[PDB]
Amino acid sequence: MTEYKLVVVGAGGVGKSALTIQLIQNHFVDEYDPTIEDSYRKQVVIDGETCLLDILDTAGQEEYSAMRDQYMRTGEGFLCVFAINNTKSFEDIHQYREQIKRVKDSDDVPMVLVGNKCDLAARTVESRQAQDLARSYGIPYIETSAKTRQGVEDAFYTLVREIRQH
Numbered sequence: 001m002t003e004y005k006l007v008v009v010g011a012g013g014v015g016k017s018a019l020t021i022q023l024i025q026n027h028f029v030d031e032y033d034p035t036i037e038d039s040y041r042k043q044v045v046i047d048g049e050t051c052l053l054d055i056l057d058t059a060g061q062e063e064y065s066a067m068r069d070q071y072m073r074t075g076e077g078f079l080c081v082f083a084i085n086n087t088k089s090f091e092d093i094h095q096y097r098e099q100i101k102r103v104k105d106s107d108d109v110p111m112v113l114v115g116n117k118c119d120l121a122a123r124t125v126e127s128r129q130a131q132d133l134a135r136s137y138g139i140p141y142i143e144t145s146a147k148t149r150q151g152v153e154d155a156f157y158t159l160v161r162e163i164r165q166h
């Protein structure tokens with residue numbers, strides 16, 4: 001069957017792991033255990049197609065930035081995550097996009113911009129600001145909450161739909 005290789009990237013603490021675990025395992029991880037690099041695989045049906053999602057949950061801690069080249073080489077699509085209550089994490093997206101662009105040698109890599117923690121009210125990144133960033137990259141913007149499940153399936157399935165357009 002068709003396999004989609006997804007990679008979840010973004011600054012430390014934005015909720016990459018919580019998002020991935022909510023999608024795959026249907027529960028919310030409340031505690032904060034920084035990731036080195038973890039892999040998840042699950043067979044799902046997306047738009048009538050039975051397929052395998054292979055998801056790489058990467059490290060946001062800058063200590064592990066040397067690992068990025070390898071996972072960017074292998075990935076077919078990237079979920080670029082920031083948190084809506086963390087302006088620095090939003091600013092950090094560009095360095096992830098720029099490396100993906102360099103490694104892929106392409107301005108047309110399948111990607112989705114994700115604003116996580118939308119259940120929280122301490123918002124410093126307004127929706128339109130993120131819409132504008134996503135527009136500049138030619139990709140969709142979606143808000144999610146790993147805590148409430150809002151938008152979670154949508155974000156990952158949208159990324160699959162972006163891979164299919166390339």
Ligand SMILES: Nc1nc2c(ncn2[C@@H]2O[C@H](COP(=O)(O)OP(=O)(O)NP(=O)(O)O)[C@@H](O)[C@H]2O)c(=O)[nH]1
Binds near residue numbers: 012015061116118
């Ligand atoms: N309220 C709320 N908290 C969230 C949400 N997503 C993640 N968190 C919380 O934010 C913290 C960090 O989440 P985590 O998934 O570990 O972040 P990460 O991006 O994987 N970190 P790292 O890059 O270090 O691996 C955890 O305490 C988690 O419960 C969300 O949507 N809403």
Ligand SMILES: [Ca+2]
Binds near residue numbers: 027028029030
């Ligand atoms: Ca829990």
Ligand SMILES: [Ca+2]
Binds near residue numbers: 107108109137138139
């Ligand atoms: Ca692009």
Ligand SMILES: [Mg+2]
Binds near residue numbers: 033
């Ligand atoms: Mg993590």
Ligand SMILES: [Mg+2]
Binds near residue numbers: 124
């Ligand atoms: Mg502002």
